Amino acid sequence: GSSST
Amino acid sequence: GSSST
Amino acid sequence: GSSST
Amino acid sequence: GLPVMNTPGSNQYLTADNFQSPCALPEFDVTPPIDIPGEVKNMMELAEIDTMIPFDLSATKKNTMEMYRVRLSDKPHTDDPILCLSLSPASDPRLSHTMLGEILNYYTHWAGSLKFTFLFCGSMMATGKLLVSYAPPGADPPKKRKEAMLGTHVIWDIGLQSSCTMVVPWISNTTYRQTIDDSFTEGGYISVFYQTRIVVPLSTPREMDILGFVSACNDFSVRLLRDTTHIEQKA
Amino acid sequence: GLPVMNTPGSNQYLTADNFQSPCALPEFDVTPPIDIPGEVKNMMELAEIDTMIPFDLSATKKNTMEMYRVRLSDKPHTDDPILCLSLSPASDPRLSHTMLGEILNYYTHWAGSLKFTFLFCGSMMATGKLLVSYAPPGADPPKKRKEAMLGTHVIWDIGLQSSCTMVVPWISNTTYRQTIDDSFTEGGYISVFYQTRIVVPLSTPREMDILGFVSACNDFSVRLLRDTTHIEQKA
């Protein structure tokens, strides 16, 4: 889906 | 939607 | 969103 | 702008492509469909309809009504063929222009079973037994009942049920055959013989015609769309 | 339209790319696979099969059946080599055309262990002990049993088990070697010697052949795909 850093 | 391998 | 056939 | 990288195929026009494009007449009020009879959903539906074979393409009979008539007579029994035909449904000149043959000439490959139905058009008083044969390829094409008997066949008894059908079952090495004359994908031999003879009483015509029809079975299919040679436009 | 910005690489054709493209034959009826025997999933499977070495490429024996035959005889013991070979599996002329050598010539780099198996083709009455050697690179190439003994080796006793295998273990400075003759990535020396001598009774051939085979071990791999020099098309 989406990774977030 | 999204498949994931 | 998403339809699926 | 979103970083993009143009790939090969960019700006080409492939005539078989399937893309969206802008509508030149936006918000156009389309006329609704009505339920017209006779809708077709697949070209093979048309191939499953019997159409009549121009069996006799002799120099004088071809391109005339006579080409569809196979003449029989009450002559003494012979083991010699009434007709001989190659199972090359798109390319043998007798099959290539039937509705089946015509649709096959828009495709490169065909597969499946076929069927030949013969109609006896003699008088009610005329009787007879005929042998309809299919020989799969690879041996000498049958020129005598003795050989034709050994292959797939139907012995037709003439009577109230006017017509008789022989099914040519899908028997092939390849999964699809070519729609042109090709030895590797050859289909074999269709032929008709006198099993006994046509017999008539007195006061009766001694010669008569049979008509023949070909159509596809429900297991029949075609593929690789192509242009036909059956129409052109020189200049 | 969506704001986009064309990046470098745009419109190029890289022959190693992996993009989607439009199908010229949409809705084509593909023929299903059948379970054909002998499917291969990786080229290294082929490299693990033993193929025979053309050891004797002398001017008269090369490009003839004789090149595969290493001649032995019952002569008195010597410490001199039966054969000498460089471990350059893609470039030494004796290895480069074996199936292993051939696959290696489509790649720039190779790594892993190999194995040499020799087959004694003399008569049952013939006996003998031979020494098969692998010397890793960096010293004088063995020309006498005395040196070859000091490296990796198998002393082969001839008998009912017709064949014997020496494994050339992966011993290298670099993680991969080049598939060409290169001093920095040199592999060392393969050689065979008489340990005792071939002995035969009377009424027996005093000379015979051994055959040799090479194949890759399960730890063997290749990389950087490239064109081979083993085929060309001048004009």
Add this chain to the structure above:
Amino acid sequence: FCGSMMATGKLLVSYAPPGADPPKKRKEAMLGTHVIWDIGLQSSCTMVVPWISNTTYRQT
């Protein structure tokens, strides 16, 4: 086989049920019931002639 140990050989032992030309060449004998005998340590070889007959008993 009563030859020496050093002697080797393969032989074909045949049984042809009746009704055709009696085999005078390996080519015909091969087509009937047979055992290809490889000579070696097991000195002997057996071919079984199976009961193949039209009648339930044959005459002596």
Add this chain to the structure above:
Amino acid sequence: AATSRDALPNTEASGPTHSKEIPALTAVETGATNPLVPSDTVQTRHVVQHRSRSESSIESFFARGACVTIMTVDNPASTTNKDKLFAVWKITYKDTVQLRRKLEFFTYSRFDMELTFVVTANFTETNNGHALNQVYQIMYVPPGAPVPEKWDDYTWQTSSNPSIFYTYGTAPARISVPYVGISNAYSHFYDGFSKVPLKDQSAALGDSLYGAASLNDFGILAVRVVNDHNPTKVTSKIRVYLKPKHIRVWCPRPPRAVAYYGPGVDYKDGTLTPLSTKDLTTY
């Protein structure tokens, strides 16, 4: 579940041995290759193996576009005595040698085919006239469909044949095609004939070429310059690149060792000595 990019097996440490187990002794007559690993014949250390066979999977080995043909076309002045050249090519991988040799490591294959087209043009006469940008038509004419006889005849209508209209100087054209064989796999080798010679038939009548199946296996590509004749003549070339995507292969074969000589396996006299001189006891 073992994938092409998985690491190969570790070397396990092994010590000295003195037993009746004889890994080194074998018998190749059986038809088998001895499955040995270094710890079978020497003392080994433990090594954690990281290398993989990812680049030698069948897919990766073939995952490159190879040139299979060069088609020549032109567009001359209208006044020329010679006809405007359009090209006709029978589709095949056997006009060039490199992809052919790679496919021929195997007897049979299945794949989807990607064709990429590189198009270049030039002037020929030491003129000073110009030419406006050319559009090319690459038409696939499958076995049975009318092959073009003139650069401008009715067949170029393409109502049913697939065609690519390529614009000069744009990205090279590209299309994909499914596995289109009439068999369950492509045969790289066919040990047979397309006809049985019968006794009751003349020899000419029963004859056919060795190893050839369908005379027109896959049809042809016909290429033309769509632009009308121009005062200054321009000649162009269309290079065709074939890539087998989604590929499966069966029955491995020794690779071609002497120069190709025709579409079959035939060889030419004077090309049969690939191997070079090297002495038996010379490193």
Add this chain to the structure above:
Amino acid sequence: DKLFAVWKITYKDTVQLRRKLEFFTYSRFDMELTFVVTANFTETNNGHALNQVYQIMYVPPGAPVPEKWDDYTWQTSSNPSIFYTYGTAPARISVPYVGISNAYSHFYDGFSKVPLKDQSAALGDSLYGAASLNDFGILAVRVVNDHNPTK
């Protein structure tokens, strides 16, 4: 003869990137190559030339190097090639860390050969600091278009 180019891949033909990398002894990296292509006329002619396509073929150590602008090697069945169209965006590809060592050596204090006593000096000789003679192979570049009246 029609000129095609052959270049042994290296960062040492120019000086600026070389000096930056040489602040360090060893390195690992993925390499991005971008290609800028320019052309011109040479003779004081008035003839024209249609737009050129270039082929940049990577020939790794061992593969046949082209001897003629049009010989069989340009088929590229296995070597990677870029067909670049003149006047389009500069071509670009990426390559993984492809070294045969665990890192690239910017300095190698050694030889690729040991000189042995039992062997002649010529036979044991090699250049100081040089490892694989053909470290990374070559790029071979050609104009794919046929000969044109104006050069």
Add this chain to the structure above:
Amino acid sequence: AATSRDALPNTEASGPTHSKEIPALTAVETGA
């Protein structure tokens, strides 16, 4: 619900016959 890409019907195995059922005999006059 039958789609254009559905597989066509299987051939079912069938044996010898001797009956009053006459599939082969027909009458095309009917228009069928």
Add this chain to the structure above:
Amino acid sequence: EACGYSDRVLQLTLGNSTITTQEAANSVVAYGRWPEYLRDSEANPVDQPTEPDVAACRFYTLDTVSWTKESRGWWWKLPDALRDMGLFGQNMYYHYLGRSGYTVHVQCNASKFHQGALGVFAVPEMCLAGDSNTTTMYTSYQNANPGEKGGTFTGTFTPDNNQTSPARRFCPVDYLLGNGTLLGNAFVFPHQIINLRTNNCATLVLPYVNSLSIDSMVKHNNWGIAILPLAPLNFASESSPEIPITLTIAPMCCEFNGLRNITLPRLQ
């Protein structure tokens, strides 16, 4: 086995025929696939197949050839080599289509004082090279199909220079496996070696292999059997030794489709 069973001692029984051997080197099953009948999911011709079972799936022995110091090698094609073998051949010529697997048993005994080694290779689609450098792919049906006598390999390529009446036959050069590839690599095909000190036979079980489920046996050969001397025959100190080589082959799981009149091929 402690009850005496050995790798070297085998018995094979198919139909009314049995082969025994006391000096085998195990046996090979090509690509690990045993022969099988055509499955319904892979079937193609719809007519009821003929499956002759024991009438055809039995061992047929071909004409014995002779191995000498000048022998370069022999070849046969399948099904061609069996086209005249009892009811197998009949079934073959009466039907358009046919498929079959095979047990191939090559026989060659000698003595503890003889030496030599035969490579016995089973090659799928064994296309051989022709004798011509004027016309490619020109080997005639008659020359491509020798039947049981088979053909031979040669150490020398010699081009047919008769342009008026060409020989139209194969010229299969031995180190090039008769097809332009090196013989040392033929071991990637299913094989065994008859090395006289070790074994007196080769046994190869071949599945039906093809790019189709069934095909014309009369037009197409599926397998080729190639036998080449990897190490030359030798004995004591005789200059001209000879030992025989016999081939016995059994069709397995063979089935045929498309029955008609019999095929009568032009074979000469």
Add this chain to the structure above:
Amino acid sequence: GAQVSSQKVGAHESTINYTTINYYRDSASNAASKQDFSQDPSKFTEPIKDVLIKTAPMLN
């Protein structure tokens, strides 16, 4: 508004799918789905008023 459908996969290397988004208000601008139906040929092959039973006489 994305539509996700499956491909009928011919040559192989689960279900493989593909995605479709319509960019325009007018359905005329849409690509062709190729998700089409089949029908029985009867209106052309058997247009007779009395249902045909193929094992029976067509005329009774």
Add this chain to the structure above:
Amino acid sequence: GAQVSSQKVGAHESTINYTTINYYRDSASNAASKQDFSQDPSKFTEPIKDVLIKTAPMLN
């Protein structure tokens, strides 16, 4: 309809992934996944009827 797979990361600067969407109905139009399987070489390296135990005599 997006497919998300991992990259095998070679030189480094978690799991790094990449995304794939198929744009066409025909699977033939798809790129190659390179998500391939390996198999054991046995059908070519050990095609013998009796299983080979490498520490044992190949001939017994």
Add this chain to the structure above:
Amino acid sequence: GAQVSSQKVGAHESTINYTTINYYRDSASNAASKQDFSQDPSKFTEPIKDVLIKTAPMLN
């Protein structure tokens, strides 16, 4: 498969982010993240065996 990271915002007009999707199977094709780590210089500035205390004599 979208990766969302924050920008270090220099000149200003919450956290501003940006999005990244990898389009290729090979990590070598990826852009550089610039999400890099720092380390202490000690292996070069203080490579001595006994830990240095800067207020103390370097030599004792």
